[PDB]
Amino acid sequence: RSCIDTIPKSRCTAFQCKHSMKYRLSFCRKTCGTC
Ligand SMILES: [Cl-]
Ligand SMILES: [Cl-]
Ligand SMILES: [Cl-]
Ligand SMILES: [Cl-]
């Protein structure tokens, strides 16, 4: 997958990164540090 967020990054919160796999893998790969 591409190393970009795919929703506005203000929604890529610490809470979502920590507690949601879909946010880590689909929506917020860059901001969550996934890639
Ligand atoms: Cl994939
Ligand atoms: Cl990548
Ligand atoms: Cl949140
Ligand atoms: Cl899920």
mmCIF file of C-alpha atoms and ligand atoms in Angstrom:
data_model
loop_
_atom_site.group_PDB
_atom_site.id
_atom_site.type_symbol
_atom_site.label_atom_id
_atom_site.label_comp_id
_atom_site.label_asym_id
_atom_site.label_seq_id
_atom_site.Cartn_x
_atom_site.Cartn_y
_atom_site.Cartn_z
ATOM 1 C CA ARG A 1 0.000 0.000 0.000
ATOM 2 C CA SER A 2 1.115 3.584 -0.373
ATOM 3 C CA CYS A 3 2.668 5.352 2.609
ATOM 4 C CA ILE A 4 0.141 8.179 2.844
ATOM 5 C CA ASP A 5 -2.847 8.987 4.976
ATOM 6 C CA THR A 6 -6.110 8.499 3.085
ATOM 7 C CA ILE A 7 -8.361 10.540 5.385
ATOM 8 C CA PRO A 8 -7.677 14.102 6.576
ATOM 9 C CA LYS A 9 -4.810 13.792 9.046
ATOM 10 C CA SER A 10 -6.618 15.628 11.838
ATOM 11 C CA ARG A 11 -8.659 12.398 12.140
ATOM 12 C CA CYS A 12 -5.463 10.329 12.457
ATOM 13 C CA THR A 13 -5.361 10.763 16.194
ATOM 14 C CA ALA A 14 -3.199 9.010 18.762
ATOM 15 C CA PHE A 15 -6.331 7.276 20.055
ATOM 16 C CA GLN A 16 -7.187 5.895 16.629
ATOM 17 C CA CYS A 17 -3.625 4.827 15.891
ATOM 18 C CA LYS A 18 -3.313 3.009 19.189
ATOM 19 C CA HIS A 19 -6.713 1.363 19.249
ATOM 20 C CA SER A 20 -7.797 0.784 15.630
ATOM 21 C CA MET A 21 -6.126 -1.540 13.160
ATOM 22 C CA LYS A 22 -8.170 -0.109 10.283
ATOM 23 C CA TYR A 23 -6.846 3.357 11.094
ATOM 24 C CA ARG A 24 -3.274 2.012 11.249
ATOM 25 C CA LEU A 25 -3.518 0.069 7.971
ATOM 26 C CA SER A 26 -6.085 1.854 5.804
ATOM 27 C CA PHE A 27 -6.616 5.483 6.795
ATOM 28 C CA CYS A 28 -3.571 6.719 8.692
ATOM 29 C CA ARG A 29 -0.558 4.693 7.614
ATOM 30 C CA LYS A 30 1.768 7.690 7.553
ATOM 31 C CA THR A 31 0.605 9.458 10.715
ATOM 32 C CA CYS A 32 0.433 6.252 12.765
ATOM 33 C CA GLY A 33 3.995 5.342 11.780
ATOM 34 C CA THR A 34 2.888 2.128 10.070
ATOM 35 C CA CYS A 35 5.212 2.855 7.159
HETATM 36 CL CL CL B 1 -3.079 -4.315 0.583
HETATM 37 CL CL CL B 2 5.605 1.939 2.232
HETATM 38 CL CL CL B 3 -10.263 10.108 18.188
HETATM 39 CL CL CL B 4 -11.760 -3.738 11.265
#
